[PDB]
A paper describes a structure:
The conserved structural components include three main parts: a baseplate, a long inner tail tube, and a tail sheath that wraps around the tube. Phage P1, a temperate phage first discovered in 1951, transfers DNA into a wide range of gram-negative bacterial species by universal transduction and has been used to construct a fine structural genetic map of E. coli.
The 53-layer tail sheath and tube of phage P1 are terminated by a hexameric terminator that covers the distal inner tail tube and embraces the top ring of the sheath. The terminator consists of six copies of protein gp24, and each gp24 consists of four domains: a central core domain (residues 23–127, 151–244), a β-hairpin domain (residues 128–150), an N-terminal domain (residues 2–22), and a C-terminal domain (residues 245–260). The inserted β-hairpin domain extends into the distal ring of the tail tube and lies in a groove formed by two adjacent tail tube subunits, and these interactions result in the tail tube protein in the top layer having a different conformation than that in the other layers. First, the N-terminal α-helix transforms into a β-strand that interacts with the β-hairpin domain of the terminator protein gp24 by β-sheet augmentation.
Residue numbers in the entry:
A (entry chain v): 3 to 528
B (entry chain e), D (entry chain f), E (entry chain a): 2 to 168
C (entry chain d): 114 to 168
F (entry chain k), G (entry chain l): 58 to 113
H (entry chain w): 425 to 528
Write the structure that this text describes.
């Protein structure tokens, strides 16, 4: 045996880092069955843009979870972590107005100048300044310090001059790590050792995920750069994130609305603003999609019911939107600190588990509630308001879902009701879900049929609908009517009627599968 | 002649749609063996198998003649028959000679690689259809040579004994 | 489930031709893969042991 | 019908090139036996074999029902079935008579001689495809004669037991 | 496709000439039995055999798993299956009846008489292809008669046990 | 084509692997100089594979 | 030809050993002197092998 | 820093270049001669053989780059200038390994 190094350099060897007394190892896996969406507040991220996060990116994208001692800023990341165990999704970040990002400007001689600007604003280069480098990622450099280093390199083959640009990260303790390195040339027509272009803005846009640059065209030609040691970004900060105005929330919701990624669920990740919830419900009803929302968990049983009516969801417009209430407490995963947060992303997990059962059409008839699909996996549950009992009938009348202890011992969601006051077989969760899935399939079929030579035709619209309805019958979503005498044995009826010649009409009826939720036993004695 | 005959093609159509609802049927010609560190022999395999996947059974006769069969311990070790083709450079013979010369245990991975589930020129495997065997011993059988078999190619028969099945 | 005795898209069964087995154990067998069998599909063989027959 | 179907002929082309990368496949009609000092009989052989190449196996049941198969001693001796054609001068019968009359041990070499690897009128052998058997005993079998077999030539069957395999 | 292919027809011509250098192949329909003093039955034989001509083998397991097979004493006695045709005068039945009635030992000579090696109307035999059995016992078997076999002739099966093979 | 039988008597034919190798028949005419005879003699004497292009 | 099946359903045909012996048909005419009949009788009576040269 | 200080990267390209030189020397004896169509089929066969041998692998990031290990294309500017180029993605070597022990 021989010596063992602690860190790897450029030599060929095997290195072992010192033993770490405390650390956590987390695995990951990717899946794209169903796509969710939402809004929230996080540590770092490009604000007001759609971000795609998977199980292996939700730490790099987004950021390190915020400490619960800060207050009301930790819920969204916990909801995202709970929901991401099934499938990936999309997130839009909302940031307060008093938020700035750092930037360093460079003089013709090469000295740096530090400043910061609001996220909305655009960089304007003062006369006498050659170029500026700023941070594209919405990451303030307060607790982790980011330093920039410049040194010279060999000139180009054609004679152009280029330099090495390096980025480093230093913690509060003093541990220094290396993030990125680049070869950059100020000349417009320059090439890398690999043949790629070395123009600073183009290279930074292409092969860098942290930095961007803006140059002044007039004065770029007669510019010189000298070697500089580590230079740290300053002035970049995030305002008090516990106080977010409704305007930012509405802007994030509007950003979600105009997205082409075609997700299949919308989630309220710890957002307790009524206007934002109503806007999210409007988005949910627009796209024929399911939706899950949550009321504030700290409210007692008595105050929870009016809080459901406070949001505008309770009515006939917003069908297939569920509201939950979870006043219990549990130990946080990252730090065992006894945090309280609601149930959003646990219901979606149950729905995704139900959807994964069937592979042809998805099997949307499975209800989220149940002791098998819906389980709450948390460390230790302690009721916030013991010796208190909810009024179950009032909750049912109020379209509020309840949580109960299962046979095994873990917490279980025991009901699934949508926000529809009328008695239409629609307050059951799956009944709107089947029809929404069928409607989406029909829309996709009709879009493709429009490219046919004839186009949309009544004869053409019947064959495809028969095929899809037969597939849905095969999956078990549609069943025969209960009374064979009154109604025919067929599960669905598709008929076409013609009045005059200008008006046609295509209609199909369906008999949805029922759920089993109330059971009664009657003992006797011989 | 028969008074119970009655036709119903909606039921048959429903059965057809239900059967066709599932994706495909795996053709028996699509598989791959790995052989751990000797990955150059994977091309020459021509026949393989999946382990038994059974348990021992315990029989107990109760009162009167009542009998019950009960689950027993898992069966670990078994045999697998593998056939390979032979080239004019003695790849299979050299492999068998090396394996006999030095006592070794080789890990063998069997997986199904259909054409439908593939990206580019590289096959992609699925966890559901992948099985593994550890601590295997590779043995040979007698190899038959004969004239008047001008239309045939020599095919050694290999016998592999595994000691653990993992998935 | 014969075709003659069926209503709608659902098959109907009869008590005379229906039998049941309880407390069964499902076991697999060796599954054969080979090339040159381009016209065949893989068919596993299952061995099931029952412990009571009821009707 | 099936929604999982997808065609990909680049993958099949890659498989075809990978299989064709190796040289050829040995035809079963190309071999040669030497029989040590009696090299005039090598022409008349019509069927041969390769020794078993196996080991004895040792079975041990661990705690609960865990079972392990372990390598054992090599297998030295065995049998090989060899068929020869018969001439009207009794070369094979005289050979067998002489072998029975005097107790002898003969070394037998089996080699593969493809047409592709040959120079001039002389075949060349390769170390990878060449095997040797030492201290062999040659025994005969019942030889069948019958009328109404006008289209067949008499083919005696020989049984050879070897005692050591060397390469 | 295959980069190892190379044609060589001089080698094949050499193998052809080497194989054709030897004379002929003995057709299995050319043989003759004598049956010692009963030489009139030699015509009616239809199937014959050559004795086993083997030895006993002694197995010894040496140190570790080393095994050696060793020659043993010659095998003298055995069985030979012979089929004869039957005439309407009961030649074979009378022969078998006479053999059973009196305990006798009959010497049988087995020879090969090809058409090429013959002078005049008399066949000539060669010492290399001639074998002899001494002190033989001739036994019969069950003989099958049936209708609807209009195209077949009755063929008794004979079982002969020899006690010494001499050449 | 892979052949399968479902519940009751329903039957499905499924796409299978592609057919690569096959046979094709070509008829040609012979000249005095023995062009085709010499071509075939050369092909038999030495093993080789050639590439044929067919155009309509 | 030797047929082999590779991974999946690919198939390759390979050159094999040469075909030596075969059969050929010849038709001739007969003269009064029994030339062909006597030729065939002599060939059947005595086993022999002859060499035939065919020219185009 | 051209990925060329590694030993095998220049060796693969040199072997491919030698094979191409031998291929193009033979094609000069073809009745047509050297042609753009002729230079594509042989090179595709050769690069497929190298792909089968394991020298060329698919790009690490399937989103940014395609799934093909090599890209062969022919470019035409006016009529007198033709151009044949092929790109390759060589196999990597494992030389630096790091282990990070933790404690529960």
């Amino acid at each position: 045996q021989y010596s063992i190094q602690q860190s790897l350099g450029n030599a060929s060897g095997v290195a072992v880092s010192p033993i770490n007394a405390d650390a956590t190892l987390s695995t990951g896996v990717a899946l794209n069955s169903s796509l969710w969406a939402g809004i929230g507040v996080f540590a770092r991220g490009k604000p007001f843009t759609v971000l795609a996060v998977t199980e292996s990116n939700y730490e790099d994208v987004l950021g390190e979870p915020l400490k619960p001692s800060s207050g009301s800023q930790f819920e969204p990341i916990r909801h995202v972590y709970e929901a991401i165990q099934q499938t990936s999704g999309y997130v839009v970040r909302a940031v307060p107005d008093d938020a700035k990002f750092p930037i360093i400007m460079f003089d013709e001689s090469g000295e740096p100048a530090y400043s910061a600007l609001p996220y909305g604003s655009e960089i304007e280069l003062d006369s006498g300044e050659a170029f500026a480098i700023y941070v594209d990622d919405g990451d303030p450099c307060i607790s982790p310090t980011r330093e920039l280093t410049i040194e010279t390199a060999t000139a180009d083959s054609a004679g152009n001059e280029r330099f090495l640009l390096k980025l480093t990260q230093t913690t509060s303790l003093g541990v220094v790590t290396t993030l990125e390195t680049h070869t950059v040339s100020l000349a417009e027509e320059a090439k890398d050792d690999m043949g790629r272009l070395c123009y600073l803005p183009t290279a930074l846009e292409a092969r860098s995920k942290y930095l961007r640059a803006v140059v002044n065209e007039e004065l770029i030609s007669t510019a010189k750069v000298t070697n500089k040691k580590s230079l740290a970004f300053t002035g970049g900060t995030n305002g008090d994130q516990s106080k977010i105005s409704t305007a930012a929330y509405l802007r994030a919701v509007k950003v979600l609305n105009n997205a082409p990624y075609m997700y299949t669920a919308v989630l309220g990740l710890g957002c307790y603003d009524n206007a934002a919830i109503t806007a999210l419900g409007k988005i949910c009803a627009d796209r024929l999609i399911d939706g899950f929302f949550d009321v504030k968990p700290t409210l007692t049983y008595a105050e929870a019911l009016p809080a459901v009516e406070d949001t505008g969801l309770l009515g006939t417009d917003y069908v297939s939107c569920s509201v939950y209430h979870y006043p219990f407490s549990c130990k946080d995963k990252w730090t065992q600190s006894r945090v309280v947060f609601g149930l959003s992303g646990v219901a979606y997990a149950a729905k995704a588990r139900g959807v994964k059962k069937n592979s042809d059409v998805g099997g949307w008839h499975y209800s989220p509630a149940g002791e098998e699909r819906a389980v709450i996996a948390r460390a230790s549950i302690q009721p916030l308001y013991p010796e208190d009992t909810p009024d179950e009938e009032a909750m049912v009348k109020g379209r509020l879902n309840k949580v109960s202890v299962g046979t095994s011992g873990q917490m279980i969601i025991d009901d699934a009701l949508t926000c529809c006051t009328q008695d239409n077989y629609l307050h059951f969760q799956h009944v709107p879900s089947l029809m929404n899935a069928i409607s989406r399939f029909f829309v996709q079929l009709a879009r493709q049929m429009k490219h046919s030579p004839d186009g949309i035709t009544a004869a053409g619209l019947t064959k495809g609908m028969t095929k899809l309805l037969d597939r849905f019958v095969a999956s078990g979503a549609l069943v025969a009517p209960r009374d064979p005498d009154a109604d025919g044995t067929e599960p669905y009826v598709l008929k076409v009627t013609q009045a005059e010649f200008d008006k046609w009409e295509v209609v199909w009826a369906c008999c949805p599968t029922g759920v089993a939720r109330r059971i009664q036993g009657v003992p006797l004695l011989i | 002649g028969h008074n119970n005959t009655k036709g119903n093609r909606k039921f048959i159509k429903g059965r057809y749609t239900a059967n066709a609802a599932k994706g495909e049927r795996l053709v028996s010609s699509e598989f791959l063996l790995t052989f751990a560190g000797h990955e150059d022999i994977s091309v020459l395999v021509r026949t393989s198998q999946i382990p038994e996947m059974t348990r021992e059974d315990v029989e107990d006769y109760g009162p009167n003649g009542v009998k019950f069969n009960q689950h027993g311990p898992i069966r670990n070790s078994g045999e697998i028959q593998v056939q390979c083709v032979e080239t004019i450079e003695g790849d299979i013979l050299q492999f068998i000679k090396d394996r006999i010369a030095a006592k070794d245990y080789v890990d063998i991975t069997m997986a199904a690689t259909p054409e439908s589930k593939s990206s580019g020129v590289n096959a992609v495997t699925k966890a559901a259809t992948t099985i593994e065997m550890l601590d295997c011993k590779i043995y040979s059988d007698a190899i038959d040579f004969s004239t008047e078999d001008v239309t045939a190619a020599v095919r050694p028969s290999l016998r592999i004994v595994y000691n653990w099945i993992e998935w």
